[PDB]
Structures are given as C-alpha cells and as structure tokens.
PDB file of C-alpha atoms in Angstrom:
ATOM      1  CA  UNK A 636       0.000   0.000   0.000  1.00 54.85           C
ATOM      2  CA  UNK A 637       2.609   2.591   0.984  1.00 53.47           C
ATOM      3  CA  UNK A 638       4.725   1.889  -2.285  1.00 56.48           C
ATOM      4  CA  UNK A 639       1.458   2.488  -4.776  1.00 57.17           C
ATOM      5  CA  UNK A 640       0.208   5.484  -2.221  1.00 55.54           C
ATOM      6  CA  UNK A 641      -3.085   5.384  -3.216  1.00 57.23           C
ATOM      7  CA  UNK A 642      -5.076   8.278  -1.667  1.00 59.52           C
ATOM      8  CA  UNK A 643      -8.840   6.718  -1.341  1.00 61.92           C
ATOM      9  CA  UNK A 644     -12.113   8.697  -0.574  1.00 62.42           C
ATOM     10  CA  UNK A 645     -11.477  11.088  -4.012  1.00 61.68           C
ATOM     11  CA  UNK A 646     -14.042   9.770  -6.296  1.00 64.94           C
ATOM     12  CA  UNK A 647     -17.343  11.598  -5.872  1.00 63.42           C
ATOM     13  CA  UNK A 648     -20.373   8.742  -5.231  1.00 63.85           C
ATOM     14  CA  UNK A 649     -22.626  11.275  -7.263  1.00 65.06           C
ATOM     15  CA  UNK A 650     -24.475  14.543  -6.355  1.00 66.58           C
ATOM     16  CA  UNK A 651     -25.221  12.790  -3.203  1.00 64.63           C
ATOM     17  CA  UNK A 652     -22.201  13.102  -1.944  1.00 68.27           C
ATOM     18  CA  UNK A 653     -22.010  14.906   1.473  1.00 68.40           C
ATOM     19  CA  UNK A 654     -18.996  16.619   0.339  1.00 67.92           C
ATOM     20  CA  UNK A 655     -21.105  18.101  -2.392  1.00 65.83           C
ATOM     21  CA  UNK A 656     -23.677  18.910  -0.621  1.00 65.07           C
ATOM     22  CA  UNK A 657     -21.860  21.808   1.201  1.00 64.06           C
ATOM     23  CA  UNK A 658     -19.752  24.415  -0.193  1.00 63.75           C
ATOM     24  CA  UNK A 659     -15.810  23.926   0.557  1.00 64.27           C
ATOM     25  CA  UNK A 660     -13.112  25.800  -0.248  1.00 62.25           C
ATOM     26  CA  UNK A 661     -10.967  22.726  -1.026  1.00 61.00           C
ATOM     27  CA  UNK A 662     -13.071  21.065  -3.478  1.00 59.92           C
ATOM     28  CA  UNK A 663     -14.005  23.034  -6.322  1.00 61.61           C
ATOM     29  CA  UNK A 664     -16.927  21.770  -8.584  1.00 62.13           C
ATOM     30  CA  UNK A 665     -18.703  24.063 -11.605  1.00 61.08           C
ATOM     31  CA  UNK A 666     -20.975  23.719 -14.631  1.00 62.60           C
ATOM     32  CA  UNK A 667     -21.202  25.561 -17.624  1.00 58.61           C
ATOM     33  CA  UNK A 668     -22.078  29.069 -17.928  1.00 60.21           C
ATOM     34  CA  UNK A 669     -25.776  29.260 -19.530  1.00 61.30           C
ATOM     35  CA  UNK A 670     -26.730  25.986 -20.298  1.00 63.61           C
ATOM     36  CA  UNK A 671     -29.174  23.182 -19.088  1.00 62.76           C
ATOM     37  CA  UNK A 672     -27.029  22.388 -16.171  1.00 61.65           C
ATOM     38  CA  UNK A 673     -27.303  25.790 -14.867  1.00 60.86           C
ATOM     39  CA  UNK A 674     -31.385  25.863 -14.463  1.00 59.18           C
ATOM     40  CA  UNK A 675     -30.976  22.403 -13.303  1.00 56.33           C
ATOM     41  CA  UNK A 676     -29.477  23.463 -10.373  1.00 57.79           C
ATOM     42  CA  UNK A 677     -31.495  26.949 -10.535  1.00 62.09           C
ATOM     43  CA  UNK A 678     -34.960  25.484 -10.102  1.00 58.78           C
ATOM     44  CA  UNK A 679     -34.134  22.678  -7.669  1.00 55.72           C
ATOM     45  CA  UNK A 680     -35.173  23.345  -3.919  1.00 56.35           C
ATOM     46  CA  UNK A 681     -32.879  21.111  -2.439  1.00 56.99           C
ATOM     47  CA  UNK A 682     -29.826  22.187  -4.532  1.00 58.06           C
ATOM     48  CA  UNK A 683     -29.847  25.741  -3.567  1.00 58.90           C
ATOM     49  CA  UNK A 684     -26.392  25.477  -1.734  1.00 56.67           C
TER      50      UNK A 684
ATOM     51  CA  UNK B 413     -57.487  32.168   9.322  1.00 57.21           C
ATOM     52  CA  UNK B 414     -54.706  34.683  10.003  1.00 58.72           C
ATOM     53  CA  UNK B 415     -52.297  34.519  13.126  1.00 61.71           C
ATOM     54  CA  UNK B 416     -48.872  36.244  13.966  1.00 60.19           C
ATOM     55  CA  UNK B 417     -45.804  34.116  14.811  1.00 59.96           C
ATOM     56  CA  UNK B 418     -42.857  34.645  16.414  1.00 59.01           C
ATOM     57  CA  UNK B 419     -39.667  33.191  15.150  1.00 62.63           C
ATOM     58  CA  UNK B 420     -35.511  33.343  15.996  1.00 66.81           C
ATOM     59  CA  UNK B 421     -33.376  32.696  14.028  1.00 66.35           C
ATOM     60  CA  UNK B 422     -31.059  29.699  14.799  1.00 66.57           C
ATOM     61  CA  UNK B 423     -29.215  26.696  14.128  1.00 68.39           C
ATOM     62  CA  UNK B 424     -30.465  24.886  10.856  1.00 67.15           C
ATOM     63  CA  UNK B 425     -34.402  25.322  12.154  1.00 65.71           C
ATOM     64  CA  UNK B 426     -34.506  29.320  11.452  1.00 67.94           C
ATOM     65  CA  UNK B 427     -31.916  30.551   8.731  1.00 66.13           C
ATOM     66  CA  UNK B 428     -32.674  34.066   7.790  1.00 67.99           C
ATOM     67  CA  UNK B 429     -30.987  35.908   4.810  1.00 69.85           C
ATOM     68  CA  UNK B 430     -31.824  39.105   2.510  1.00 71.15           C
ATOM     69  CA  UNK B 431     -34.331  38.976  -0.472  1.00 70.25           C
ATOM     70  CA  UNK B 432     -32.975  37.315  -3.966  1.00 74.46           C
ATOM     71  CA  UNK B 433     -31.334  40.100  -5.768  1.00 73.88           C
ATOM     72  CA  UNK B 434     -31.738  37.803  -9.160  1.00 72.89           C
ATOM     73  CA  UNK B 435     -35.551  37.178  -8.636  1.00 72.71           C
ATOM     74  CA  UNK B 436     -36.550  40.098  -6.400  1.00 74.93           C
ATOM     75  CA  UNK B 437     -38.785  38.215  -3.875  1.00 76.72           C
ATOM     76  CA  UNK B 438     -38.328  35.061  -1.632  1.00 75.81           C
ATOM     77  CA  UNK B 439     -36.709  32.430  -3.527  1.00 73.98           C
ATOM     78  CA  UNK B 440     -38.007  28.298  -3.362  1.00 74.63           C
ATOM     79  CA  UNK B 441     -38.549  27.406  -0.391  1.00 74.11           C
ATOM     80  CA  UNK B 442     -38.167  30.187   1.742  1.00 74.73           C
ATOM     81  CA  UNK B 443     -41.210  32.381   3.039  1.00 75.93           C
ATOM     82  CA  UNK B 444     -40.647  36.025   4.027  1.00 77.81           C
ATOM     83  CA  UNK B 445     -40.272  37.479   7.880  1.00 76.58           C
ATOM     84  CA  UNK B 446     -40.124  41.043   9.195  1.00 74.41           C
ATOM     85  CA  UNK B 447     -37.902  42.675  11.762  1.00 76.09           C
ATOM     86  CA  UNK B 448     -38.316  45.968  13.497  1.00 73.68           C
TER      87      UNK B 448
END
C-alpha cells in the first residue's frame, strides 16, 4: 500500500455526496455558464447550496 | 385564518438571509419574515 500510495475517498459517489452537498473551499466543482445544467441546479429546492 | 408568529433565528431550524437580488422576492422554499 505505501509503495502504490493510493489516496482513497477522491471519487465523488454522485451529487449525493455529502462533500457536495456543502460548499468547501478545497473542493471546487462548476458547470457551464448558460446551459441546461445551470437551471438544473437553478430550479431545484434542495440544490440551492 | 390569520395569526402572527414569532420566530428566531437559529441553528439549521430558522436561517434568515436578505431577499434574492436575481428574482426580487423570496426564492423556493423560503417564506418572508419582518424585523423591526
């Protein structure tokens, strides 16, 4: 393990991730400026964070 | 019918913030409160 030094716990599950459900200023995630994605995230309730 | 309620704001059960400055009014679920 120590001579591969694999860092687990970095892929994201999904958008139910708990790490991407609050905002951090070490992980970093965008979208698109203008596009579907945008007023995806726009109109949900939940995703207002 | 109508009734006043009281409300402070706290912890992750009250969580007040200004009007939307994009829409103009309260945004999805959120409902407006005063303050003197």
């Amino acid at each position: 393990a120590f001579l591969v030094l694999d860092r687990p716990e970095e892929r994201i599950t999904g958008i139910n991730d708990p790490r991407l459900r609050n905002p951090s200023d070490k992980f970093i995630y965008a979208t698109v400026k203008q596009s579907s994605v945008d007023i995806y995230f726009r109109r949900q309730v939940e995703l207002s964070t | 019918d109508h009734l006043s309620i009281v409300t402070l704001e706290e912890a992750p059960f009250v969580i007040v913030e200004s009007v939307d400055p994009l829409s103009g009014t309260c945004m999805r679920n959120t409902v407006p409160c005063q303050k003197r």
